[PDB]
């Protein structure tokens, strides 16, 4: 609710959909963010997507067809740069 | 003081990004 962290993995040889590697909330979410930054994993703020995925998905699952492109757009930007 | 378990740390290390609100 207050704080959300969703980890995203991606490998196109396995499926065209991104894969959710973690879902944490509140204080644990804040620790995920700090560690991610410390170990050089990009942390991207997108408040509506974070909520969406939290409300629709369980951890260790592929993003459903409905939200695939909204998630993939982030990976594509990070690749463009 | 460690907040995260080993498996969560690994999951983070194995991700392309973390999406947050």
Author numbering:
A (entry chain B): 258 to 338
B (entry chain A): 237 to 257
Task: Please give sentences taken from the publication describing this entry.
The pathogenic bacterium Shigella flexneri uses a type III secretion system to inject virulence factors from the bacterial cytosol directly into host cells. One of the inner membrane components, Spa40, belongs to a family of proteins proposed to regulate the switching of substrate specificity of the export apparatus. The S. flexneri protein Spa40 has been identified as a component of the basal body and is predicted to have a large, N-terminal transmembrane domain (Spa40TM) and a C-terminal cytoplasmic domain (Spa40C).
The model comprises residues 237–257 of Spa40CN (residues 207–236 were present in the construct but not visible in electron density) and 258–338 of Spa40CC (the last four residues, 339–342, were not visible in electron density). The structure was refined using data to 2 Å with residuals Rwork and Rfree of 17.8% and 22.7% respectively. The structure of Spa40C consists of a central β-sheet surrounded by four α-helices. The structured region of Spa40CN consists of a single α-helix (α1) followed by a single β-strand (β1) that lies at the centre of the structure and forms one strand of the five-stranded β-sheet. The NPTH sequence lies on a loop between β1 and β2, the PTH region having flipped away from N257, revealing that the cleavage of the N257-P258 peptide bond results in a conformational change to this loop region. The striking feature of these structures is that Spa40CN forms part of the core of the fold with the conserved hydrophobic residues L253 to M256 (LVVM) completely buried by the surrounding Spa40CC structure. In Spa40, the face of this helix that is exposed on the surface is composed of residues K305, R308, K309 and K312, resulting in a highly positively charged patch.
